[PDB]
Write a protein that binds this ligand. Structure first.
Ligand SMILES: Nc1nc2c(ncn2[C@@H]2O[C@H](COP(=O)(O)OP(=O)(O)O)[C@@H](O)[C@H]2O)c(=O)[nH]1
Ligand SMILES: [Mg+2]
Length: 348
């Protein structure tokens, strides 16, 4: 029936003066908040309030989806042979679960994570050295032995990592050694125009012992700090996009591929295409051996269902159906072949 303004105001959990100015902008006349509202008007208020409150919750949804979730830094390790690359990766692999008994069951997916209080770091670990494959690492850790120092190979790796677009972090290794001269290496860096932060330059340089583990925990915090600065994010709802780390044959399983997920979320049953390779994702396994229904940005998973071995560095793309996967793969397969007469029938 006929509601009093203060009764409706309470009904909507609304402020007296708030409802009064609402009536004012609605063009509904009154005396005071004691005044009776008609049935039309009262319903118009309930309806207008519902819309205004609807839009406000809608409008705030678009705004917080504007902010994309954080993603972990993807780190690669480089530098001259014997400088400790493998030793560092091994210590890092034994770092994360360093107090646990097994389980895992631990499997090699092409990269592994280090869970740390300040955050999570992803380390590419794969055989082989340094077209090129689509961007993988955000950060390159350039390892330098303190008893040897910068070598032409070190300079090559520094150049490679910059060309690929990686941020550089210099790790001076083997500081445990008595013949180690960390300062000498620092001078070598500065001679080449890399000036350590302590001296007011932007070069990030940390002392480490891959044998001992000294500086390693500090190296991690530095990686995460540089990530905080760089502010890496990714959209888990974007069309799924990833990169092949490696492809492999297994006697029982057949063709298997490790991929790093970059954007979106891949799901079991998805059709994917990498280069000329396509397939349906049959299964996914993470570094902990667990089966995975979904893999989001930063996730490194072993994928089943590829029809051919993909190539390392090729972009894994999501496709709607099998038909699209085949057509997309075949146009690329035909591009390569047909164009190969162009490098043959022409100049050798
Ligand atoms: N003392 C000491 N030896 C190290 C350190 N890091 C690596 N090494 C040694 O360097 C040798 C080769 O290391 P490796 O990781 O295979 O070099 P890589 O080619 O860069 O991978 C091994 O015998 C390690 O024991 C370190 O921090 N301290
Ligand atoms: Mg080695």
């Amino acid at each position: 029936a006929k509601v009093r303004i203060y009764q409706l105001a309470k009904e909507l959990g609304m402020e007296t003066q708030e409802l009064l100015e609402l009536l004012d902008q609605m063009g509904v006349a009154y005396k005071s908040h004691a005044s009776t509202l008609e049935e039309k008007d009262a319903e118009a208020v309930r309806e207008l309030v519902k819309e205004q409150r609807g839009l406000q919750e809608k409008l705030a949804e678009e705004e917080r989806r504007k902010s994309l979730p954080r993603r972990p830094p993807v780190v690669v390790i480089m530098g001259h042979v014997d400088h400790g690359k493998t030793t560092l990766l091994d210590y890092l692999r034994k770092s994360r679960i360093a107090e646990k008994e097994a389980g895992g069951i631990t499997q090699h997916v092409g990269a592994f994570e280090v869970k740390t209080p300040q955050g999570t770091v992803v380390f590419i670990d794969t055989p082989g050295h340094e077209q090129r494959g689509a961007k993988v690492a955000d950060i390159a850790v350039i390892v330098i032995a303190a008893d040897d120092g910068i070598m032409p190979q070190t300079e090559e790796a520094i150049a490679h990592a910059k060309a690929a677009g990686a941020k550089l972090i210099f790790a001076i290794n083997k500081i445990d050694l008595p013949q180690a001269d960390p300062e000498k290496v620092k001078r070598q860096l500065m001679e080449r125009g890399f000036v350590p932060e302590e001296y007011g330059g932007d070069a990030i340089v940390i002392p480490i012992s891959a044998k001992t583990g000294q500086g390693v925990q500090d190296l991690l915090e530095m990686i995460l700090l540089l990530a905080e600065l760089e502010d890496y994010r990714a959209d888990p709802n974007a069309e799924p996009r990833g990169v092949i780390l490696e492809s492999k044959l297994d006697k029982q399983a057949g063709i298997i591929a490790n991929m790093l997920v970059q954007e979106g979320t891949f799901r079991v049953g998805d059709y994917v295409v990498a280069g000329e390779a396509y397939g349906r994702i049959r299964a996914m396994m993470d570094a902990d051996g667990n089966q995975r229904k979904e893999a989001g940005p930063g996730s490194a998973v072993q994928v089943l269902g590829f029809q051919e071995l993909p190539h390392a560095g090729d972009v894994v793309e999501w496709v709607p159906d099998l038909e699209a996967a085949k057509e997309i793969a075949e146009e690329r397969k035909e591009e390569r072949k047909a164009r190969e007469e162009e490098e043959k029938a022409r100049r050798p």
